[PDB]
Design a protein around this motif. Structure first.
Motif, PDB file in Angstrom:
ATOM      1  N   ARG A 183       1.440   7.129  -4.415  1.00  0.00           N
ATOM      2  CA  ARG A 183       0.918   6.550  -3.191  1.00  0.00           C
ATOM      3  C   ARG A 183       0.976   5.037  -3.333  1.00  0.00           C
ATOM      4  NH1 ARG A 183      -3.033  10.367  -4.994  1.00  0.00           N
ATOM      5  NH2 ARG A 183      -2.909  12.376  -3.910  1.00  0.00           N
ATOM      6  N   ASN A 184       0.866   4.321  -2.212  1.00  0.00           N
ATOM      7  CA  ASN A 184       0.847   2.848  -2.262  1.00  0.00           C
ATOM      8  C   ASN A 184      -0.051   2.356  -1.126  1.00  0.00           C
ATOM      9  OD1 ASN A 184       1.517   0.117  -3.047  1.00  0.00           O
ATOM     10  ND2 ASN A 184       3.503   0.871  -3.765  1.00  0.00           N
ATOM     11  N   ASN A 185      -1.328   2.121  -1.463  1.00  0.00           N
ATOM     12  CA  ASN A 185      -2.407   1.718  -0.559  1.00  0.00           C
ATOM     13  C   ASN A 185      -2.977   2.904   0.199  1.00  0.00           C
ATOM     14  OD1 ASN A 185      -1.909  -0.848  -1.552  1.00  0.00           O
ATOM     15  ND2 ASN A 185      -0.798  -1.552   0.273  1.00  0.00           N
ATOM     16  N   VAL A 186      -4.088   3.420  -0.299  1.00  0.00           N
ATOM     17  CA  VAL A 186      -4.853   4.458   0.365  1.00  0.00           C
ATOM     18  C   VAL A 186      -6.193   3.851   0.737  1.00  0.00           C
ATOM     19  CG1 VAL A 186      -5.469   6.902   0.320  1.00  0.00           C
ATOM     20  CG2 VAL A 186      -3.705   6.041  -1.184  1.00  0.00           C
ATOM     21  N   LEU A 187      -6.560   3.976   2.010  1.00  0.00           N
ATOM     22  CA  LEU A 187      -7.877   3.555   2.457  1.00  0.00           C
ATOM     23  C   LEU A 187      -8.949   4.300   1.669  1.00  0.00           C
ATOM     24  CD1 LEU A 187      -9.531   1.972   4.458  1.00  0.00           C
ATOM     25  CD2 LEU A 187      -9.258   3.866   6.070  1.00  0.00           C
ATOM     26  N   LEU A 188      -9.979   3.568   1.228  1.00  0.00           N
ATOM     27  CA  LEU A 188     -11.028   4.185   0.420  1.00  0.00           C
ATOM     28  C   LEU A 188     -11.711   5.345   1.158  1.00  0.00           C
ATOM     29  CD1 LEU A 188     -12.747   4.296  -2.087  1.00  0.00           C
ATOM     30  CD2 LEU A 188     -14.224   2.430  -1.187  1.00  0.00           C
ATOM     31  N   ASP A 189     -11.940   5.214   2.476  1.00  0.00           N
ATOM     32  CA  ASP A 189     -12.504   6.343   3.225  1.00  0.00           C
ATOM     33  C   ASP A 189     -11.622   7.583   3.090  1.00  0.00           C
ATOM     34  OD1 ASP A 189     -12.654   3.604   4.579  1.00  0.00           O
ATOM     35  OD2 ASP A 189     -14.423   4.550   5.473  1.00  0.00           O
TER      36      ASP A 189
ATOM     37  N   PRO B 150      -6.927   0.586  -2.452  1.00  0.00           N
ATOM     38  CA  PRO B 150      -6.278   0.616  -3.767  1.00  0.00           C
ATOM     39  C   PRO B 150      -4.939   1.325  -3.662  1.00  0.00           C
ATOM     40  CG  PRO B 150      -8.199   2.086  -3.714  1.00  0.00           C
ATOM     41  CD  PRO B 150      -8.221   1.282  -2.443  1.00  0.00           C
ATOM     42  N   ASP B 151      -4.084   1.069  -4.648  1.00  0.00           N
ATOM     43  CA  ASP B 151      -2.705   1.541  -4.564  1.00  0.00           C
ATOM     44  C   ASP B 151      -2.641   3.057  -4.547  1.00  0.00           C
ATOM     45  OD1 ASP B 151      -1.337  -0.872  -4.460  1.00  0.00           O
ATOM     46  OD2 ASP B 151      -1.401  -1.115  -6.642  1.00  0.00           O
ATOM     47  N   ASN B 152      -3.451   3.709  -5.370  1.00  0.00           N
ATOM     48  CA  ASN B 152      -3.291   5.135  -5.603  1.00  0.00           C
ATOM     49  C   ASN B 152      -4.576   5.642  -6.241  1.00  0.00           C
ATOM     50  OD1 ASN B 152      -2.166   7.690  -5.860  1.00  0.00           O
ATOM     51  ND2 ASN B 152      -0.325   6.999  -6.975  1.00  0.00           N
ATOM     52  N   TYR B 153      -4.618   6.945  -6.491  1.00  0.00           N
ATOM     53  CA  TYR B 153      -5.757   7.535  -7.175  1.00  0.00           C
ATOM     54  C   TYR B 153      -5.318   8.854  -7.785  1.00  0.00           C
ATOM     55  CZ  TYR B 153      -6.174  10.647  -3.165  1.00  0.00           C
ATOM     56  OH  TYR B 153      -5.925  11.564  -2.173  1.00  0.00           O
ATOM     57  N   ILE B 154      -6.129   9.336  -8.724  1.00  0.00           N
ATOM     58  CA  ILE B 154      -5.965  10.666  -9.301  1.00  0.00           C
ATOM     59  C   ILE B 154      -7.301  11.382  -9.187  1.00  0.00           C
ATOM     60  CG2 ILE B 154      -5.395  12.032 -11.343  1.00  0.00           C
ATOM     61  CD1 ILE B 154      -3.837   9.676 -12.378  1.00  0.00           C
ATOM     62  N   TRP B 155      -7.317  12.513  -8.503  1.00  0.00           N
ATOM     63  CA  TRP B 155      -8.515  13.337  -8.414  1.00  0.00           C
ATOM     64  C   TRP B 155      -8.283  14.520  -9.335  1.00  0.00           C
ATOM     65  CZ3 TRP B 155     -13.274  13.782  -8.420  1.00  0.00           C
ATOM     66  CH2 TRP B 155     -13.954  14.953  -8.084  1.00  0.00           C
ATOM     67  N   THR B 156      -8.996  14.547 -10.455  1.00  0.00           N
ATOM     68  CA  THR B 156      -8.808  15.613 -11.431  1.00  0.00           C
ATOM     69  C   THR B 156      -9.607  16.868 -11.103  1.00  0.00           C
ATOM     70  OG1 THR B 156     -10.632  14.960 -12.851  1.00  0.00           O
ATOM     71  CG2 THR B 156      -8.552  13.805 -13.136  1.00  0.00           C
ATOM     72  N   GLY B 157     -10.505  16.811 -10.129  1.00  0.00           N
ATOM     73  CA  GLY B 157     -11.441  17.876  -9.887  1.00  0.00           C
ATOM     74  C   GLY B 157     -12.819  17.620 -10.454  1.00  0.00           C
ATOM     75  N   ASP B 158     -12.932  16.739 -11.450  1.00  0.00           N
ATOM     76  CA  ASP B 158     -14.227  16.294 -11.945  1.00  0.00           C
ATOM     77  C   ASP B 158     -14.398  14.787 -11.940  1.00  0.00           C
ATOM     78  N   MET B 159     -13.319  14.011 -11.915  1.00  0.00           N
ATOM     79  CA  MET B 159     -13.449  12.564 -11.984  1.00  0.00           C
ATOM     80  C   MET B 159     -12.355  11.932 -11.140  1.00  0.00           C
ATOM     81  SD  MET B 159     -13.264  10.039 -15.194  1.00  0.00           S
ATOM     82  CE  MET B 159     -12.778  11.561 -16.020  1.00  0.00           C
ATOM     83  N   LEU B 160     -12.679  10.792 -10.536  1.00  0.00           N
ATOM     84  CA  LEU B 160     -11.762  10.065  -9.670  1.00  0.00           C
ATOM     85  C   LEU B 160     -11.308   8.804 -10.390  1.00  0.00           C
ATOM     86  CD1 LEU B 160     -10.309   9.617  -7.000  1.00  0.00           C
ATOM     87  CD2 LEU B 160     -12.277   8.333  -6.240  1.00  0.00           C
ATOM     88  N   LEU B 161     -10.003   8.698 -10.654  1.00  0.00           N
ATOM     89  CA  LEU B 161      -9.416   7.478 -11.190  1.00  0.00           C
ATOM     90  C   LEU B 161      -8.796   6.692 -10.040  1.00  0.00           C
ATOM     91  CD1 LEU B 161      -7.764   9.059 -14.361  1.00  0.00           C
ATOM     92  CD2 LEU B 161     -10.116   8.305 -13.967  1.00  0.00           C
ATOM     93  N   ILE B 162      -9.378   5.541  -9.734  1.00  0.00           N
ATOM     94  CA  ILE B 162      -8.795   4.601  -8.781  1.00  0.00           C
ATOM     95  C   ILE B 162      -7.739   3.783  -9.514  1.00  0.00           C
ATOM     96  CG2 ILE B 162      -9.221   2.580  -7.333  1.00  0.00           C
ATOM     97  CD1 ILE B 162     -10.429   5.090  -6.159  1.00  0.00           C
ATOM     98  N   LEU B 163      -6.524   3.768  -8.987  1.00  0.00           N
ATOM     99  CA  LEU B 163      -5.397   3.150  -9.663  1.00  0.00           C
ATOM    100  C   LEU B 163      -4.926   1.940  -8.878  1.00  0.00           C
ATOM    101  CD1 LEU B 163      -5.446   5.632 -11.463  1.00  0.00           C
ATOM    102  CD2 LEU B 163      -3.164   6.212 -10.572  1.00  0.00           C
ATOM    103  N   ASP B 164      -4.625   0.843  -9.577  1.00  0.00           N
ATOM    104  CA  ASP B 164      -3.852  -0.202  -8.930  1.00  0.00           C
ATOM    105  C   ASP B 164      -2.781  -0.671  -9.897  1.00  0.00           C
ATOM    106  OD1 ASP B 164      -4.426  -1.604  -6.087  1.00  0.00           O
ATOM    107  OD2 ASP B 164      -3.322  -3.043  -7.342  1.00  0.00           O
TER     108      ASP B 164
END
Ligand SMILES: COC(=O)/C(O)=C/C(=O)C1(Cc2ccc(Cl)cc2)CCN(Cc2cccc(Cl)c2)CC1
Ligand SMILES: [Cl-]
Ligand SMILES: [Cl-]
Ligand SMILES: [Cl-]
Ligand SMILES: [Mn+2]
Ligand SMILES: [Mn+2]
Length: 180
Positions: A48-54, A76-90
């Motif tokens: 992904r490249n820029n996802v609105l936080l909402d 932020p550019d991207n994210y990973i939702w593992t099912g237990d934790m959210l990694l916000i990526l830039d």
């Protein structure tokens, strides 16, 4: 091919500092997006490249009522939702640390509080490539644990070639030199 050729066509035609400054910015953004695509490919994660936080919150927690919370509309550019934790990526591409520190500070102070009120465990991850050395630096302990090696094959030389041609074309231009 087509990306390089499009910038080349623009550098060939450009005549003014203001338009040249926009080409330079565009090259730096294309270099950033190139790294992001190669990084997600290497890690086999969604690009992904820029996802609105909402929109990130709605994907991890579909039953949320956005209106109950004060959500900063950062992208932020991207994210990973593992099912237990959210990694916000830039992604970053830079020889220095300053842009990383700026973004780290912004997302830490703007994202973490609302994620804590919502109840979503979140880490701010910034992944920087040095465009000269190809070395990768990672801020984010859970990201490092999940991805201990990053098997990317990076080549930024064409982005440097394009920008150097732009800078050579305007090396005697006071105005462009200031728009540095
Ligand atoms: C490296 O990380 C970032 O700086 C980043 O992702 C920025 C952006 O997304 C924005 C666009 C952008 C600008 C320059 C660069 Cl080089 C990369 C992307 C989106 C619109 N408004 C802010 C900047
Ligand atoms: Cl022009
Ligand atoms: Cl003119
Ligand atoms: Cl943002
Ligand atoms: Mn971005
Ligand atoms: Mn980025």
């Amino acid at each position: 091919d087509p990306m390089y050729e499009q910038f080349l066509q623009r550098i060939q035609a450009v005549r003014t500092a203001t338009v040249a400054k926009d080409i330079s910015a565009d090259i730096l953004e294309a270099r950033h997006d190139y790294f992001g695509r190669e990084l997600c490919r290497a890690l086999d994660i969604e690009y992904r490249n820029n996802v609105l936080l909402d929109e990130i919150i709605l994907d991890v927690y579909p039953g949320v009522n956005l209106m109950e919370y004060n959500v900063p509309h950062v992208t932020p550019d991207n994210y990973i939702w593992t099912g237990d934790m959210l990694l916000i990526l830039d992604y970053k591409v830079s020889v220095g640390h300053d842009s990383t520190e700026v973004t780290y500070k912004k997302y830490t102070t703007l994202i973490l509080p609302v994620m804590q009120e919502i109840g979503i465990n979140t880490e701010i991850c910034i992944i920087r490539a040095n465009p000269v050395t190809n070395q990768i630096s990672i801020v984010g302990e859970q990201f490092k644990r999940l991805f201990p090696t990053i098997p990317v094959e990076l080549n930024f030389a064409r982005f440097f070639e394009l920008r150097k041609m732009l800078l050579d074309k305007f090396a005697d231009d006071e105005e462009f030199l200031m728009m540095i």
